[PDB]
């Protein structure tokens, strides 16, 4: 080669995504206490 080119290029990389949190009692049952009492019998699904 007898010449050269100074090239600038872009590389786009993801780093993080949105941090989400879920309340089980609001999602599965909302505000009803009967569903909350029945959901208490399902153990540690929501802790997991």
């Amino acid at each position: 080669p007898t010449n050269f080119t100074i090239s600038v290029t872009t590389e786009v990389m993801p780093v993080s995504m949105t941090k989400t949190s879920v309340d089980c009692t609001m999602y599965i049952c909302g505000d009803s206490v009967e569903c909350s009492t029945l959901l208490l019998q399902y153990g540690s699904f929501c802790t997991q």
């Binding site: 949190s21 309340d23 089980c24 009692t25 206490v33 540690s44 802790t47």
Partner: protein, 48 residues
């Protein structure tokens, strides 16, 4: 007078109850009730 409450009881190895938490009392009790432990480590916890 008894009211509709959610409580967590600590059962001894002999079967007796040795400690209790009223989950509606203060934010610390709500933090303890969101987990299943009477001891909470240092950190920030989302509470139900």
């Amino acid at each position: 007078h008894l009211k509709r409450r959610t409580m967590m009881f600590k059962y001894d190895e002999n079967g007796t109850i040795v400690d209790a938490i009223d989950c509606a009392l203060d934010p610390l009790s709500e933090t303890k009730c969101t987990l299943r432990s009477f001891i909470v480590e240092k950190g920030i916890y989302q509470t139900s």
